[PDB]
Amino acid sequence: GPIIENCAAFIEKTMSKYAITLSDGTILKSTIKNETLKKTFPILKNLLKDQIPTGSSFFKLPVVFFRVTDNVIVILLTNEKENIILSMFELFSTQFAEKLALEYPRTYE
Amino acid sequence: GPIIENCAAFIEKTMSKYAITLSDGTILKSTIKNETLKKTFPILKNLLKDQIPTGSSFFKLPVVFFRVTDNVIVILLTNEKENIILSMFELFSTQFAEKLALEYPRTYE
């Protein structure tokens, strides 16, 4: 929906290679090639167990993951400095995390 | 010039053993000494005779090849996994393929 288009435009201000995915592997938007993105998912699936809590990030350069909400992951391919990337993630979360959390909630019962 | 130096710095962030060559074998940058690098050439020569497409890669780990432009090849000797390697190649091409075409154009005379 509109929230994903707005998220994508925000990232694309500075990053041309990104994806927005759900924690189960569903691709919501991507400028990363499909085959490349598919190959990174096993890394993400294993890291989601105990290495990336909601709100945290993980750097495996050039791949960067940001778990903005329980179910929504931002993926970048980047060689930008860490602090530049984290500043963008912080502003992204401020703008979008509340809407994303209701759009893609996780079942607890 | 600055173009090949920027390419080298990009790869070097995560990989120490690589070469960037023209498709005819002219070395633009290499951290792999010719005594080791030559043992990758039977594979490369075969890929070139098979006219491997630009943008494609070939893995025979630890050796990896990526045809970033029609006439420029990246060679790696690495213990990294395929998924991260493919992401590195994709971002490398995004950042440098157009610049490499201008700096090392195909020679047709």
From TrEMBL, chains A, B:
Q: Which domain of life is it from?
A: Archaea
What is the covered span of the full protein? 2 to 108 of 268
Query: Would you tell me the protein name for this molecule?
Result: Uncharacterized protein
Q: What organism is listed for this UniProt entry?
A: Promethearchaeum syntrophicum
